[PDB]
């Protein structure tokens, strides 16, 4: 009864946001998609051929197929009782890289360089990521001035 | 709608685009001594009345239009059928319109 066709909940989602109507900029096209990249999917209302669905907006998947001017993605979609890895064919205009994997590759390269320098000079560099520790026992300063006194203010309207 | 008379389209016999005569499909006069017709008369005879259901509730008032095509080249003569979408009003091949025209109604 919700008129189950394609693209029905999308008065806002496939819209080009604001002061960005018009032609697509070409840096979206001129990018390199190899098998094994990790891509975000974001709807573009200007190119109406290969929009994915309203389901896969914002989902982040793996690339496995490359054609002339589109790309095939595998995306984990949740349905009723289980999640499934589906296979979508999306044009290039809806796609961008996730910066998360590139940040992780920078982590891996820093870890390899620290590992080589550590095996070189015998240092134990602790190249894991430690979460935010509690504050160490620091030592505050109150020179010159007594601390400012605060009190709750009287009500007015 | 409106289709042209000649229309260069692929015909599967000689593997190329060839020009085609485009005519209206006729349903064709249905025949006695087919399999289902002989079975229908064999089951219709005897005291049984109407065995198989006849149809009443016709709702689609439009019929799909299919076209007979012929390769105009001699000794090829390959015919095949092709479908269009539904239409209520149909003309075969005349009266293409102009845009520089005054109506005069």
């Amino acid at each position: 009864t919700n008129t189950k066709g394609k693209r029905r909940g999308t008065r806002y989602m496939f819209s080009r946001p604001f002061r960005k109507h018009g032609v697509v900029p070409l840096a979206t096209y001129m990018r390199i998609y190899k098998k094994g990249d990790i891509v975000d999917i974001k709807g573009m209302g200007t190119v109406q051929k290969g929009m994915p669905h309203k389901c896969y907006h914002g989902k982040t998947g793996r690339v496995y197929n490359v054609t002339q001017h589109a790309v095939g993605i595998v995306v984990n979609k949740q349905v009723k009782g289980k999640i499934l890895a589906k296979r979508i064919n999306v044009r290039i205009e809806h796609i961008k890289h996730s910066k998360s994997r590139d940040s992780f590759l920078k982590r891996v390269k820093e870890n390899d360089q620290k590992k080589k320098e550590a095996k070189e000079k015998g240092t134990w560099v602790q190249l894991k990521r430690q979460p935010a520790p509690p504050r160490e026992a620091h030592f505050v300063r109150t020179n010159g001035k007594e601390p400012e006194l605060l009190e709750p203010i009287p009500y007015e309207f | 709608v409106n289709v042209p008379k000649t229309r260069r389209t692929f015909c599967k016999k000689c593997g190329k685009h060839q020009p085609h005569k485009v005519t209206q499909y006729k349903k064709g006069k249905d025949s006695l001594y087919a399999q289902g017709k002989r079975r229908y008369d064999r089951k219709q005879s005897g005291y049984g009345g109407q065995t198989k259901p006849i149809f009443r509730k016709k709702a689609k008032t439009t019929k799909k239009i299919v076209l007979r095509l012929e390769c105009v080249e001699p000794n090829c003569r390959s015919k095949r059928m092709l479908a269009i979408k539904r239409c209520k009003h149909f003309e075969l091949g005349g009266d293409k319109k102009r845009k520089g025209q005054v109506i005069q109604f």
Binding site: Y64, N65, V66, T67, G72, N76, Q78, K80, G81, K82, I83, L84, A85, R87 | -
Partner: protein
């Protein structure tokens, strides 16, 4: 004669009994659906790998063993 038409209550608690796990994803993923031109490339690539990859790769294995 009226009944409750549609609901989604008590559904998440059914779904998380056995658990909403992932779809396994083993090594060497299924290769159907990929570009037929690329697939026609890769099949002749594989069989000519297995054809001509004996002699020069054996030479290079001997060379890298002699180096190290």
């Amino acid at each position: 004669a009226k009944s409750k038409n549609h609901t989604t209550h008590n559904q998440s608690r059914k779904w998380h009994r056995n658990g909403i796990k992932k779809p396994r994803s083993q090594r060497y993923e299924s290769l159907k659906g990929v570009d037929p031109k690329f697939l026609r490339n890769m099949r002749f690539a594989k069989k000519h790998n297995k054809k001509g990859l004996k002699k020069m790769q054996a030479n290079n294995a001997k060379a890298m063993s002699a180096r190290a």
